[PDB]
Amino acid sequence: TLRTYIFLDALQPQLATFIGKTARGFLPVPGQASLWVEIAPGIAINRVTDAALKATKVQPAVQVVERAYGLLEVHHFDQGEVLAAGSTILDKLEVREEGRLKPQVMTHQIIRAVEAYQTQIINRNSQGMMILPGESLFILETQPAGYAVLAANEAEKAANVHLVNVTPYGAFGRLYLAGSEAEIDAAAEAAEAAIRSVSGVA
Amino acid sequence: MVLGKVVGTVVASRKEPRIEGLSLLLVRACDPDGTPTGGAVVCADAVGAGVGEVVLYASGSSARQTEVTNNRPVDATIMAIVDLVEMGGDVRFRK
């Protein structure tokens, strides 16, 4: 069951830095073309990964077996390789582009002037760049979990913010973003427009 | 020392042997407006003046007060090129 199929054309450097910090695999560099596939049950993702690797020369970084879900990231500099890998993944599961679930935003907030007594908690809860006291905060939760990196990537392509945390595997893909008010506002508008512009099965 | 336009060039062939290698220029004296009217004196170039430029030249014993024209029979030498002529608040001539 295909839950998430999202194609990232170019990785912005904080997302690629965060994946290179917190993945189990071959770490991606900025500028590469990436693909995120989340299916259920979370052990057929090894078969999906085997099909994508035996077809093309794409390279995996994130291959995570969750409680019920399964995530695969592949990436290469040439987008033809990643698109052919995605075509092989859709042919192995015998599903289409729009067989994926339509992503739902279940919590979006812009918290402004975050106190120090919250930023210390957020700092000892994450892995990305440290939120600083006084900076704005954009939190975001998307269902399914695999679309959150999309909500990460477009929020850096159209703004100049810092990535605090992104968890793309689980029951809710979570995204934290720190920065000034105009930059968090631009990143929030861009990410909320990026999630809602994805077709699929509701 | 009076200001005039460099009208022409004079090429002497048989000359006094000290002043060889020294350029000669017909300078006719002009008004501070900038139009030449007067007698044309054959004076020696010491700055690099060409045809049509407005220059100062100085005639007399103070025509020899240059390294170039030190002990030479040089009656008048060109010591400066006019860039501007102020005449009581109206710039009559520019370079």
Binding site: - | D83, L84, E86, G89, V91, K95
Partner: protein
């Protein structure tokens, strides 16, 4: 814009002598004097580049016979930001 001639003299009679010679020497607008305190007084004159370059040299010759000159300088083309945030006459 217009070139900038400046002569700073520790005296005050030296500044008036330098400003007078810079005005008499060429078609240059005397545009003011700047009192930076402690004796030091700068005559700021401002015109075309040939005019300022002749005037400022003549004013340097004249100020050194009357007082102690401190600094003599010419900017041939002052930047727009310079004339903006300084009292140099051509501020808009």
């Amino acid at each position: 814009a217009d070139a900038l001639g400046m002569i700073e003299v520790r005296g005050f009679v030296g500044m008036v002598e330098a400003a007078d010679a810079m005005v008499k020497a060429a078609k240059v607008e005397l545009i003011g004097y700047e009192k930076t305190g402690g004796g030091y007084v700068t005559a700021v004159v401002r015109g075309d580049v040939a005019a300022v370059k002749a005037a400022t040299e003549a004013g340097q010759r004249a100020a050194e016979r009357v007082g102690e000159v401190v600094a003599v300088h010419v900017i041939p083309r002052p930047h727009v930001n310079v004339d903006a945030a300084l009292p140099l006459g051509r501020t808009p």
